[PDB]
Design a binder for this molecule. Structure first.
Ligand code: GNP
Length: 300
């Protein structure tokens, strides 16, 4: 029930938060407007809120419901369906190496997610290597090097400002030579220039093909739930630039903006591989839609 308390701030307005809104009320246009306002304040987003209201209105009409309290169950089903469409756990087994290209802006949890994932894979018996492909941020590169040395995890890094694609190429070659199961590659996160960063990512992906026609095996976006709609605009920008195959959504604990997960799910349809629900390694949890919905909707 750790997930339940990590969602405590989001549950004021969503899930169990619906109970106080519906109590004793009739289903009418006023109620659907109050619900729409609550969804929007919770960062569910305009398009996804409209879809939820439309589907809920139709679902209640088909059953000729009049008691607003029963909208709780319909919302649980319908918001559950939104998340079920992006429930698909990441499987990194069986490659040599499985290459995860980590993309996203700076400051939203990318290097922390790299460390937690690396520790989780090693805890499962997989060997891990890191590639310090954010080559102009010497602090980020030093962070991976020092942390990897402490953890007996090899880190491939080159001089400040080295070509990111070449660093990652060299890391894949090294991983293949050293029986590495998983290679996790960091990338630059300065999206102030759309064209440049997005051209760098395309170059990285093309260069990988010299060594493995299947690499990268996962392109993972990291976004921060506490940034609300910025998480959605970041996903949209990276989705148009590169072939995203997974999303990690960090910092759900302690934000009232957790509703953004429904917007990310609905707008892009990309699997949410992990959600960050605390500061421990194990608090980067593989995303399971039914578990999340149960925690969000359970009262108390
Ligand atoms: N509570 C919480 N904090 C998280 C989570 N994921 C990352 N963080 C925190 O947010 C920060 C991580 O951001 P970070 O990975 O440093 O982003 P970055 O771009 O790699 N680094 P920088 O901050 O130098 O730009 C740290 O405070 C880290 O502990 C999460 O799921 N929950």
């Amino acid at each position: 029930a750790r997930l339940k308390r990590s969602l405590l701030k989001t549950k004021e307005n969503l899930g169990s938060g619906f109970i106080s809104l519906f109590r004793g009320k009739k289903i009418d246009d006023d109620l659907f407007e109050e619900l729409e306002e609550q969804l929007l304040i919770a960062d569910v987003g305009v398009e996804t809120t409209r879809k939820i209201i439309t589907n809920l209105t139709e679902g209640a009409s088909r059953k000729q419901l009049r008691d607003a309290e029963a909208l709780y169950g319909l919302l649980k089903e319908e918001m559950g369906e939104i998340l079920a469409k992006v429930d698909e756990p990441l499987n990194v087994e069986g490659k040599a190496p499985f290459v995860i290209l980590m993309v996203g802006v700076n400051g939203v949890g990318k290097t922390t997610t790299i460390g937690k994932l690396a520790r989780q894979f090693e805890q499962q018996g997989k060997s891990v290597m890191l590639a310090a492909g954010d080559t102009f941020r010497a602090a980020a590169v030093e962070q991976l090097q020092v942390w990897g040395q402490r953890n007996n995890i090899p880190v491939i890094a080159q001089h400040t400002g080295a070509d990111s694609a070449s660093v990652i190429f060299d890391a894949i070659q090294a991983a293949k030579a050293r029986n590495i199961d998983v290679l996790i590659a960091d990338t630059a996160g300065r999206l102030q220039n759309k064209s440049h960063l997005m051209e760098e990512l395309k170059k990285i992906v093309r260069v990988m093909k010299k060594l493995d026609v299947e690499a990268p095996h996962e392109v993972m976006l990291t976004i921060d739930a506490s940034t609300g709609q910025n998480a959605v605009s970041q996903a949209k920008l990276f989705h148009e630039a590169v072939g995203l195959t997974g999303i990690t959504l960090t910092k759900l604990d302690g934000t009232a903006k957790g509703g953004v997960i429904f917007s990310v799910a609905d707008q892009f349809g990309i699997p949410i591989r992990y959600i960050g629900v605390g500061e421990r390694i194990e608090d980067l949890r593989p995303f399971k839609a039914d578990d999340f919905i149960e925690a969000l909707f359970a009262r108390e």
